[PDB]
Amino acid sequence: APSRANTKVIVVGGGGTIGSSTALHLVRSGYTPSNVTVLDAYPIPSSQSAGNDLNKIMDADADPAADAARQMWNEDELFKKFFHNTGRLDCCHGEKDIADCKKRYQNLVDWGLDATVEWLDSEDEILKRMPQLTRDQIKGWKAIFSKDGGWLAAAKAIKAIGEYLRDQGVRFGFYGAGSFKQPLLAEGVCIGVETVDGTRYYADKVVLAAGAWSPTLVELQEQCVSKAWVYGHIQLTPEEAARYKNSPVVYNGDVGFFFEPNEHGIIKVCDEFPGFTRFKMHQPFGAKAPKRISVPRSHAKHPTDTIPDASIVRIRRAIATFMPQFKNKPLFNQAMCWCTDTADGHLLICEHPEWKNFYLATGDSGDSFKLLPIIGKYVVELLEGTLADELAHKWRWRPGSGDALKSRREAPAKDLADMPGWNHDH
Ligand SMILES: *Cc1cc2c(cc1C)nc1c(=O)[nH]c(=O)nc-1n2C[C@H](O)[C@H](O)[C@H](O)COP(=O)(O)OP(=O)(O)OC[C@H]1O[C@@H](n2cnc3c(N)ncnc32)[C@H](O)[C@@H]1O
Protein backbone atom coordinates (compact mmCIF):
# COMPACT_ATOMS: atom_id res chain seq x y z
CA ALA A 1 0.00 0.00 0.00
CA PRO A 2 1.57 3.34 -1.04
CA SER A 3 1.83 6.50 1.07
CA ARG A 4 -1.00 9.01 0.73
CA ALA A 5 1.22 11.12 -1.55
CA ASN A 6 1.68 8.20 -3.96
CA THR A 7 -1.88 6.81 -3.94
CA LYS A 8 -4.13 7.36 -7.00
CA VAL A 9 -7.86 7.62 -6.30
CA ILE A 10 -10.81 7.96 -8.70
CA VAL A 11 -13.94 9.58 -7.29
CA VAL A 12 -16.96 8.61 -9.38
CA GLY A 13 -19.71 11.18 -8.80
CA GLY A 14 -17.14 13.69 -7.65
CA GLY A 15 -19.36 16.54 -8.94
CA GLY A 16 -21.92 15.65 -6.25
CA THR A 17 -22.24 15.89 -2.47
CA ILE A 18 -20.39 12.87 -1.06
CA GLY A 19 -18.03 12.72 -4.03
CA SER A 20 -16.93 16.38 -3.89
CA SER A 21 -16.44 16.04 -0.10
CA THR A 22 -14.35 12.91 -0.68
CA ALA A 23 -12.12 14.77 -3.15
CA LEU A 24 -11.75 17.67 -0.70
CA HIS A 25 -10.76 15.42 2.18
CA LEU A 26 -8.26 13.50 0.00
CA VAL A 27 -6.54 16.83 -0.83
CA ARG A 28 -6.74 18.07 2.79
CA SER A 29 -5.28 14.70 3.95
CA GLY A 30 -2.10 15.11 1.77
CA TYR A 31 -3.00 13.05 -1.29
CA THR A 32 -1.25 14.58 -4.31
CA PRO A 33 -3.97 16.55 -6.17
CA SER A 34 -2.93 15.30 -9.63
CA ASN A 35 -3.28 11.75 -8.28
CA VAL A 36 -6.98 12.42 -7.59
CA THR A 37 -9.39 12.15 -10.54
CA VAL A 38 -12.99 13.33 -10.25
CA LEU A 39 -15.33 11.72 -12.78
CA ASP A 40 -18.92 12.93 -13.14
CA ALA A 41 -21.61 12.77 -15.78
CA TYR A 42 -21.86 16.58 -15.42
CA PRO A 43 -19.29 19.23 -14.46
CA ILE A 44 -19.05 20.12 -10.77
CA PRO A 45 -21.46 21.14 -9.27
CA SER A 46 -23.28 18.48 -11.28
CA SER A 47 -26.55 19.69 -12.75
CA GLN A 48 -28.24 16.43 -11.60
CA SER A 49 -26.66 16.31 -8.12
CA ALA A 50 -29.24 16.40 -5.30
CA GLY A 51 -26.95 19.03 -3.77
CA ASN A 52 -27.31 21.34 -6.78
CA ASP A 53 -30.01 23.37 -5.03
CA LEU A 54 -30.59 26.93 -3.89
CA ASN A 55 -31.11 25.69 -0.33
CA LYS A 56 -31.28 22.76 2.03
CA ILE A 57 -32.27 22.62 5.71
CA MET A 58 -29.68 22.45 8.48
CA ASP A 59 -31.38 20.91 11.52
CA ALA A 60 -30.03 20.05 15.02
CA ASP A 61 -29.19 16.35 14.75
CA ALA A 62 -27.23 15.14 17.86
CA ASP A 63 -25.60 12.34 15.80
CA PRO A 64 -21.70 12.50 15.73
CA ALA A 65 -21.36 12.99 11.94
CA ALA A 66 -24.09 15.68 11.98
CA ASP A 67 -22.36 17.34 14.95
CA ALA A 68 -18.97 17.35 13.30
CA ALA A 69 -20.55 18.78 10.14
CA ARG A 70 -22.32 21.48 12.18
CA GLN A 71 -19.00 22.54 13.71
CA MET A 72 -17.53 22.93 10.18
CA TRP A 73 -20.55 24.88 8.90
CA ASN A 74 -19.89 27.24 11.80
CA GLU A 75 -16.10 27.37 11.71
CA ASP A 76 -14.57 26.09 8.48
CA GLU A 77 -13.72 28.99 6.20
CA LEU A 78 -14.54 27.15 2.98
CA PHE A 79 -18.11 26.41 4.19
CA LYS A 80 -19.12 28.98 6.80
CA LYS A 81 -20.51 31.65 4.45
CA PHE A 82 -23.02 29.17 3.03
CA PHE A 83 -24.76 28.44 6.34
CA HIS A 84 -27.61 30.82 7.17
CA ASN A 85 -28.50 30.60 10.84
CA THR A 86 -32.16 31.72 10.46
CA GLY A 87 -33.52 28.99 12.74
CA ARG A 88 -36.53 26.83 11.96
CA LEU A 89 -40.25 27.18 12.71
CA ASP A 90 -41.87 23.75 12.89
CA CYS A 91 -45.65 24.19 12.85
CA CYS A 92 -48.19 21.54 13.89
CA HIS A 93 -51.97 21.33 13.59
CA GLY A 94 -54.54 18.69 14.46
CA GLU A 95 -54.60 16.62 17.64
CA LYS A 96 -52.17 13.97 16.39
CA ASP A 97 -49.46 16.27 15.02
CA ILE A 98 -49.74 18.59 18.06
CA ALA A 99 -49.35 15.65 20.49
CA ASP A 100 -46.27 14.50 18.53
CA CYS A 101 -44.71 18.00 18.51
CA LYS A 102 -45.38 18.44 22.24
CA LYS A 103 -43.67 15.08 22.97
CA ARG A 104 -40.75 16.18 20.75
CA TYR A 105 -40.49 19.48 22.61
CA GLN A 106 -40.64 17.72 25.99
CA ASN A 107 -37.84 15.36 24.87
CA LEU A 108 -35.61 18.44 24.44
CA VAL A 109 -36.57 19.77 27.87
CA ASP A 110 -35.68 16.24 29.05
CA TRP A 111 -32.73 14.83 27.03
CA GLY A 112 -30.02 17.29 25.97
CA LEU A 113 -31.73 20.42 27.35
CA ASP A 114 -33.81 22.95 25.41
CA ALA A 115 -32.07 26.33 25.62
CA THR A 116 -32.39 27.36 21.96
CA VAL A 117 -35.95 26.00 21.48
CA GLU A 118 -39.34 27.65 22.21
CA TRP A 119 -42.88 26.30 22.35
CA LEU A 120 -45.45 28.57 20.62
CA ASP A 121 -48.89 27.73 22.02
CA SER A 122 -51.17 29.90 19.85
CA GLU A 123 -51.57 31.55 16.47
CA ASP A 124 -50.65 34.94 17.94
CA GLU A 125 -47.40 33.58 19.45
CA ILE A 126 -46.50 32.16 16.01
CA LEU A 127 -47.30 35.55 14.41
CA LYS A 128 -45.08 37.38 16.88
CA ARG A 129 -42.22 35.20 15.64
CA MET A 130 -43.28 35.28 11.97
CA PRO A 131 -45.50 38.30 11.23
CA GLN A 132 -45.54 37.42 7.50
CA LEU A 133 -47.97 34.52 8.15
CA THR A 134 -51.73 35.05 7.90
CA ARG A 135 -53.85 34.27 10.95
CA ASP A 136 -56.85 32.82 9.10
CA GLN A 137 -54.57 30.20 7.49
CA ILE A 138 -53.00 28.99 10.76
CA LYS A 139 -56.11 28.50 12.91
CA GLY A 140 -55.41 25.93 15.62
CA TRP A 141 -51.65 25.82 14.84
CA LYS A 142 -48.86 25.51 17.40
CA ALA A 143 -45.12 25.49 16.73
CA ILE A 144 -41.61 24.78 17.94
CA PHE A 145 -39.16 27.56 17.13
CA SER A 146 -35.48 26.49 17.10
CA LYS A 147 -32.82 29.22 16.95
CA ASP A 148 -30.23 26.63 15.98
CA GLY A 149 -29.81 25.64 12.34
CA GLY A 150 -31.43 27.30 9.33
CA TRP A 151 -30.44 26.70 5.73
CA LEU A 152 -27.47 25.88 3.51
CA ALA A 153 -26.67 27.45 0.14
CA ALA A 154 -26.12 23.96 -1.32
CA ALA A 155 -25.04 24.49 -4.95
CA LYS A 156 -22.77 27.33 -3.86
CA ALA A 157 -21.01 25.11 -1.29
CA ILE A 158 -20.34 22.35 -3.87
CA LYS A 159 -19.20 25.01 -6.35
CA ALA A 160 -16.75 26.37 -3.74
CA ILE A 161 -15.36 22.85 -3.30
CA GLY A 162 -14.91 22.50 -7.05
CA GLU A 163 -13.04 25.85 -7.28
CA TYR A 164 -10.76 24.75 -4.43
CA LEU A 165 -10.07 21.38 -6.10
CA ARG A 166 -9.46 23.01 -9.49
CA ASP A 167 -6.97 25.48 -8.00
CA GLN A 168 -5.17 22.54 -6.22
CA GLY A 169 -4.68 20.68 -9.56
CA VAL A 170 -7.20 17.82 -9.14
CA ARG A 171 -7.94 16.09 -12.43
CA PHE A 172 -11.47 16.04 -13.87
CA GLY A 173 -13.39 14.08 -16.47
CA PHE A 174 -16.95 15.01 -17.46
CA TYR A 175 -19.72 13.97 -19.87
CA GLY A 176 -18.62 10.96 -21.92
CA ALA A 177 -15.16 11.14 -20.26
CA GLY A 178 -16.78 11.13 -16.80
CA SER A 179 -19.86 8.85 -17.03
CA PHE A 180 -19.01 5.56 -15.36
CA LYS A 181 -19.79 2.40 -17.32
CA GLN A 182 -17.86 -0.31 -15.40
CA PRO A 183 -15.08 -0.97 -12.95
CA LEU A 184 -11.87 -2.42 -14.37
CA LEU A 185 -11.23 -5.70 -12.56
CA ALA A 186 -8.02 -7.76 -12.58
CA GLU A 187 -8.61 -11.08 -10.77
CA GLY A 188 -11.14 -9.66 -8.36
CA VAL A 189 -9.19 -6.45 -7.73
CA CYS A 190 -10.54 -3.14 -8.95
CA ILE A 191 -7.73 -1.24 -10.74
CA GLY A 192 -9.74 1.55 -12.38
CA VAL A 193 -12.85 2.67 -14.21
CA GLU A 194 -14.10 2.73 -17.79
CA THR A 195 -16.45 5.53 -18.90
CA VAL A 196 -19.18 5.55 -21.60
CA ASP A 197 -16.84 7.08 -24.22
CA GLY A 198 -14.35 4.19 -23.73
CA THR A 199 -11.79 6.11 -21.65
CA ARG A 200 -9.96 3.90 -19.14
CA TYR A 201 -8.61 5.45 -15.95
CA TYR A 202 -6.34 3.45 -13.65
CA ALA A 203 -5.97 4.02 -9.89
CA ASP A 204 -5.19 2.26 -6.58
CA LYS A 205 -8.69 2.99 -5.20
CA VAL A 206 -12.09 3.77 -6.68
CA VAL A 207 -14.99 5.47 -4.84
CA LEU A 208 -18.53 5.21 -6.23
CA ALA A 209 -20.36 8.28 -4.90
CA ALA A 210 -23.05 8.25 -7.59
CA GLY A 211 -26.00 9.06 -5.30
CA ALA A 212 -29.32 7.84 -6.67
CA TRP A 213 -27.49 6.43 -9.72
CA SER A 214 -25.35 4.07 -7.59
CA PRO A 215 -27.82 1.09 -7.77
CA THR A 216 -28.20 1.66 -11.53
CA LEU A 217 -24.44 1.50 -12.07
CA VAL A 218 -23.46 -1.56 -10.04
CA GLU A 219 -25.52 -4.40 -8.60
CA LEU A 220 -26.56 -3.41 -5.05
CA GLN A 221 -29.24 -6.10 -4.45
CA GLU A 222 -32.01 -3.59 -3.55
CA GLN A 223 -29.98 -2.24 -0.57
CA CYS A 224 -30.63 1.24 -2.01
CA VAL A 225 -33.89 2.29 -3.72
CA SER A 226 -33.83 5.60 -5.60
CA LYS A 227 -36.64 8.11 -5.12
CA ALA A 228 -37.45 11.70 -6.13
CA TRP A 229 -38.65 14.70 -4.19
CA VAL A 230 -40.04 17.88 -5.74
CA TYR A 231 -39.94 21.62 -5.56
CA GLY A 232 -40.69 24.78 -7.42
CA HIS A 233 -39.91 28.48 -7.15
CA ILE A 234 -41.75 31.80 -6.93
CA GLN A 235 -40.26 35.21 -7.70
CA LEU A 236 -40.76 38.05 -5.19
CA THR A 237 -40.26 41.75 -5.93
CA PRO A 238 -37.40 43.45 -4.03
CA GLU A 239 -39.96 44.97 -1.67
CA GLU A 240 -41.74 41.64 -1.08
CA ALA A 241 -38.43 39.79 -0.62
CA ALA A 242 -37.22 42.33 1.98
CA ARG A 243 -40.06 41.29 4.28
CA TYR A 244 -38.55 37.80 4.43
CA LYS A 245 -34.92 38.71 4.99
CA ASN A 246 -33.41 36.23 7.51
CA SER A 247 -36.77 34.50 7.83
CA PRO A 248 -36.66 31.03 9.44
CA VAL A 249 -37.24 27.86 7.51
CA VAL A 250 -40.99 27.29 7.87
CA TYR A 251 -42.21 23.68 7.98
CA ASN A 252 -45.54 21.96 8.62
CA GLY A 253 -45.43 18.19 8.02
CA ASP A 254 -49.05 18.16 6.82
CA VAL A 255 -48.32 20.92 4.25
CA GLY A 256 -44.71 21.37 3.07
CA PHE A 257 -42.02 23.97 3.66
CA PHE A 258 -40.30 27.02 2.28
CA PHE A 259 -37.18 29.06 2.59
CA GLU A 260 -36.12 32.68 2.83
CA PRO A 261 -35.72 34.26 -0.62
CA ASN A 262 -32.26 34.05 -2.17
CA GLU A 263 -30.34 37.17 -3.24
CA HIS A 264 -32.43 37.32 -6.45
CA GLY A 265 -35.75 37.26 -4.48
CA ILE A 266 -36.66 33.62 -5.29
CA ILE A 267 -38.49 31.45 -2.71
CA LYS A 268 -38.27 27.68 -3.06
CA VAL A 269 -41.31 25.70 -1.90
CA CYS A 270 -41.37 21.96 -1.24
CA ASP A 271 -43.88 19.24 -0.61
CA GLU A 272 -43.64 16.75 2.27
CA PHE A 273 -44.24 13.16 1.11
CA PRO A 274 -42.50 9.71 0.86
CA GLY A 275 -40.87 10.17 -2.52
CA PHE A 276 -41.41 8.79 -6.03
CA THR A 277 -39.73 5.87 -7.76
CA ARG A 278 -39.30 5.42 -11.48
CA PHE A 279 -39.06 1.72 -12.11
CA LYS A 280 -37.79 0.44 -15.44
CA MET A 281 -35.69 -2.40 -16.78
CA HIS A 282 -31.94 -1.82 -16.44
CA GLN A 283 -28.79 -3.99 -16.11
CA PRO A 284 -26.18 -2.62 -13.63
CA PHE A 285 -22.62 -3.90 -13.84
CA GLY A 286 -22.61 -7.16 -11.89
CA ALA A 287 -26.21 -8.10 -12.84
CA LYS A 288 -26.60 -11.15 -15.11
CA ALA A 289 -29.79 -9.88 -16.86
CA PRO A 290 -31.94 -6.70 -16.85
CA LYS A 291 -33.85 -6.11 -13.61
CA ARG A 292 -36.76 -3.86 -12.68
CA ILE A 293 -35.15 -1.15 -10.60
CA SER A 294 -35.83 2.48 -9.80
CA VAL A 295 -33.78 4.48 -12.28
CA PRO A 296 -33.59 8.26 -11.80
CA ARG A 297 -35.41 10.34 -14.41
CA SER A 298 -32.82 13.09 -14.52
CA HIS A 299 -33.93 16.69 -14.94
CA ALA A 300 -30.43 17.48 -16.33
CA LYS A 301 -30.88 14.87 -19.09
CA HIS A 302 -34.56 15.84 -19.57
CA PRO A 303 -34.83 19.60 -18.81
CA THR A 304 -38.38 19.74 -20.20
CA ASP A 305 -39.50 17.47 -17.30
CA THR A 306 -41.39 19.13 -14.48
CA ILE A 307 -43.08 17.41 -11.48
CA PRO A 308 -46.35 15.41 -11.14
CA ASP A 309 -49.68 17.23 -11.13
CA ALA A 310 -50.32 15.92 -7.62
CA SER A 311 -47.10 17.63 -6.58
CA ILE A 312 -48.08 21.00 -8.09
CA VAL A 313 -51.39 20.79 -6.23
CA ARG A 314 -49.58 20.16 -2.92
CA ILE A 315 -47.10 22.99 -3.51
CA ARG A 316 -49.98 25.33 -4.46
CA ARG A 317 -51.69 24.34 -1.21
CA ALA A 318 -48.48 25.15 0.66
CA ILE A 319 -48.26 28.64 -0.95
CA ALA A 320 -51.99 29.18 -0.25
CA THR A 321 -51.43 28.30 3.42
CA PHE A 322 -48.11 29.97 4.12
CA MET A 323 -48.11 32.87 1.62
CA PRO A 324 -51.74 33.45 0.46
CA GLN A 325 -50.73 36.94 -0.76
CA PHE A 326 -48.52 35.23 -3.40
CA LYS A 327 -50.99 32.63 -4.72
CA ASN A 328 -51.07 34.22 -8.19
CA LYS A 329 -47.29 33.97 -8.72
CA PRO A 330 -46.18 31.30 -11.28
CA LEU A 331 -44.35 28.28 -9.89
CA PHE A 332 -41.27 27.94 -12.07
CA ASN A 333 -38.13 25.84 -12.42
CA GLN A 334 -40.17 22.87 -11.18
CA ALA A 335 -37.89 19.83 -10.81
CA MET A 336 -37.49 16.35 -9.41
CA CYS A 337 -34.41 15.78 -7.22
CA TRP A 338 -33.16 12.22 -6.62
CA CYS A 339 -31.80 10.43 -3.53
CA THR A 340 -31.43 6.76 -2.60
CA ASP A 341 -32.89 5.18 0.57
CA THR A 342 -31.53 2.25 2.49
CA ALA A 343 -33.93 0.14 4.52
CA ASP A 344 -32.87 1.69 7.82
CA GLY A 345 -31.99 5.16 6.49
CA HIS A 346 -28.26 4.88 7.37
CA LEU A 347 -25.53 5.37 4.81
CA LEU A 348 -23.85 2.69 2.72
CA ILE A 349 -20.13 3.37 3.07
CA CYS A 350 -18.13 0.19 2.61
CA GLU A 351 -15.71 -1.74 0.43
CA HIS A 352 -17.43 -3.88 -2.20
CA PRO A 353 -17.50 -7.50 -0.88
CA GLU A 354 -16.04 -8.97 -4.13
CA TRP A 355 -14.18 -6.14 -5.92
CA LYS A 356 -11.17 -5.21 -3.79
CA ASN A 357 -10.36 -1.44 -3.71
CA PHE A 358 -13.81 -0.52 -5.05
CA TYR A 359 -15.72 1.42 -2.39
CA LEU A 360 -19.39 2.40 -2.13
CA ALA A 361 -20.25 5.82 -0.66
CA THR A 362 -24.00 6.21 -1.04
CA GLY A 363 -27.30 5.40 0.77
CA ASP A 364 -27.72 9.14 1.47
CA SER A 365 -31.41 8.45 2.42
CA GLY A 366 -32.54 11.99 1.75
CA ASP A 367 -30.85 13.73 4.67
CA SER A 368 -27.14 13.89 3.91
CA PHE A 369 -26.62 17.32 2.35
CA LYS A 370 -25.87 18.73 5.83
CA LEU A 371 -22.95 16.26 6.00
CA LEU A 372 -21.15 17.81 3.00
CA PRO A 373 -18.27 19.31 5.06
CA ILE A 374 -17.45 16.09 6.98
CA ILE A 375 -18.59 13.07 4.99
CA GLY A 376 -15.48 12.75 2.83
CA LYS A 377 -13.39 12.39 6.00
CA TYR A 378 -15.14 9.09 6.78
CA VAL A 379 -14.71 7.95 3.16
CA VAL A 380 -10.95 8.57 3.38
CA GLU A 381 -10.88 6.64 6.64
CA LEU A 382 -12.67 3.74 4.95
CA LEU A 383 -10.11 3.77 2.10
CA GLU A 384 -7.27 3.70 4.66
CA GLY A 385 -8.75 1.01 6.93
CA THR A 386 -9.23 3.41 9.85
CA LEU A 387 -13.00 4.03 9.92
CA ALA A 388 -14.39 3.58 13.44
CA ASP A 389 -15.72 0.02 13.79
CA GLU A 390 -19.20 1.16 14.97
CA LEU A 391 -19.56 3.28 11.85
CA ALA A 392 -18.12 0.60 9.62
CA HIS A 393 -20.88 -1.66 10.99
CA LYS A 394 -23.68 0.91 10.71
CA TRP A 395 -22.74 1.67 7.08
CA ARG A 396 -21.89 -1.95 6.06
CA TRP A 397 -22.88 -3.94 2.96
CA ARG A 398 -26.32 -5.28 3.95
CA PRO A 399 -28.57 -6.71 1.22
CA GLY A 400 -31.65 -8.41 2.63
CA SER A 401 -31.73 -6.07 5.64
CA GLY A 402 -35.24 -4.70 4.93
CA ASP A 403 -37.48 -3.12 2.31
CA ALA A 404 -35.91 0.11 1.07
CA LEU A 405 -39.09 0.95 -0.91
CA LYS A 406 -40.67 2.00 2.37
CA SER A 407 -37.38 2.46 4.30
CA ARG A 408 -38.13 4.28 7.56
CA ARG A 409 -40.73 6.48 5.87
CA GLU A 410 -44.51 6.49 6.29
CA ALA A 411 -45.31 4.51 3.16
CA PRO A 412 -43.73 2.80 0.14
CA ALA A 413 -42.95 5.37 -2.55
CA LYS A 414 -45.42 5.67 -5.42
CA ASP A 415 -44.11 5.46 -8.96
CA LEU A 416 -43.86 8.20 -11.62
CA ALA A 417 -45.53 5.83 -14.17
CA ASP A 418 -48.69 6.35 -12.10
CA MET A 419 -48.30 10.10 -11.43
CA PRO A 420 -49.18 12.20 -14.57
CA GLY A 421 -47.96 15.71 -15.36
CA TRP A 422 -44.12 15.64 -15.24
CA ASN A 423 -43.24 14.27 -18.69
CA HIS A 424 -43.40 16.78 -21.58
CA ASP A 425 -41.43 14.82 -24.17
CA HIS A 426 -44.24 14.29 -26.75
C1 LIG B 1 -33.69 15.77 -3.60
C2 LIG B 1 -33.72 16.43 -2.23
C3 LIG B 1 -32.72 16.13 -1.33
C4 LIG B 1 -32.60 16.76 -0.08
C5 LIG B 1 -33.56 17.72 0.27
C6 LIG B 1 -34.56 18.06 -0.67
C7 LIG B 1 -34.68 17.43 -1.89
C8 LIG B 1 -35.81 17.85 -2.82
N1 LIG B 1 -33.52 18.37 1.48
C9 LIG B 1 -32.46 18.14 2.27
C10 LIG B 1 -32.32 18.89 3.44
O1 LIG B 1 -33.12 19.80 3.74
N2 LIG B 1 -31.24 18.58 4.25
C11 LIG B 1 -30.31 17.61 3.95
O2 LIG B 1 -29.33 17.48 4.70
N3 LIG B 1 -30.43 16.88 2.84
C12 LIG B 1 -31.46 17.14 2.04
N4 LIG B 1 -31.61 16.42 0.87
C13 LIG B 1 -30.68 15.30 0.61
C14 LIG B 1 -29.41 15.55 0.02
O3 LIG B 1 -29.62 16.39 -1.07
C15 LIG B 1 -28.76 14.23 -0.37
O4 LIG B 1 -28.80 13.27 0.70
C16 LIG B 1 -27.31 14.42 -0.79
O5 LIG B 1 -27.20 15.61 -1.55
C17 LIG B 1 -26.93 13.26 -1.69
O6 LIG B 1 -25.55 13.23 -1.96
P1 LIG B 1 -24.91 12.12 -2.91
O7 LIG B 1 -23.50 12.51 -3.05
O8 LIG B 1 -25.23 10.72 -2.47
O9 LIG B 1 -25.70 12.36 -4.27
P2 LIG B 1 -25.55 13.56 -5.35
O10 LIG B 1 -25.16 14.83 -4.71
O11 LIG B 1 -26.79 13.54 -6.16
O12 LIG B 1 -24.30 13.15 -6.21
C18 LIG B 1 -24.26 11.99 -7.04
C19 LIG B 1 -23.41 12.33 -8.25
O13 LIG B 1 -23.23 11.14 -9.07
C20 LIG B 1 -23.13 11.61 -10.41
N5 LIG B 1 -23.32 10.52 -11.35
C21 LIG B 1 -24.49 9.84 -11.62
N6 LIG B 1 -24.32 8.94 -12.55
C22 LIG B 1 -22.96 8.96 -12.82
C23 LIG B 1 -22.16 8.21 -13.70
N7 LIG B 1 -22.66 7.25 -14.47
N8 LIG B 1 -20.84 8.49 -13.72
C24 LIG B 1 -20.37 9.47 -12.94
N9 LIG B 1 -21.04 10.27 -12.12
C25 LIG B 1 -22.34 9.93 -12.09
C26 LIG B 1 -24.19 12.69 -10.53
O14 LIG B 1 -24.10 13.49 -11.69
C27 LIG B 1 -24.00 13.40 -9.19
O15 LIG B 1 -23.13 14.53 -9.30
Author numbering: 2 to 427
Paper text:
In the present study, we set out to enhance the thermal stability of the L3-35A mutant by implementing a methodological approach whereby different thermal stabilization strategies are tested in parallel and their efficiency compared. On the other hand, the introduction of extensive surface charges and salt bridges (mutant C16) resulted in a further increase in Tm of ≈ 1.5 °C (Tm = 55.2 °C). We observed that the activity of the enzyme variants towards fK and fV remained similar to that of the parent enzyme, with a slight increase of activity in the case of D02 and a slight decrease in all the other cases. In this process, while the amino acids that are directly involved in the catalytic function were not modified, some tunnel-lining residues were replaced.
This is due to their buried active site and narrow access tunnel, as determined in multiple crystal structures.
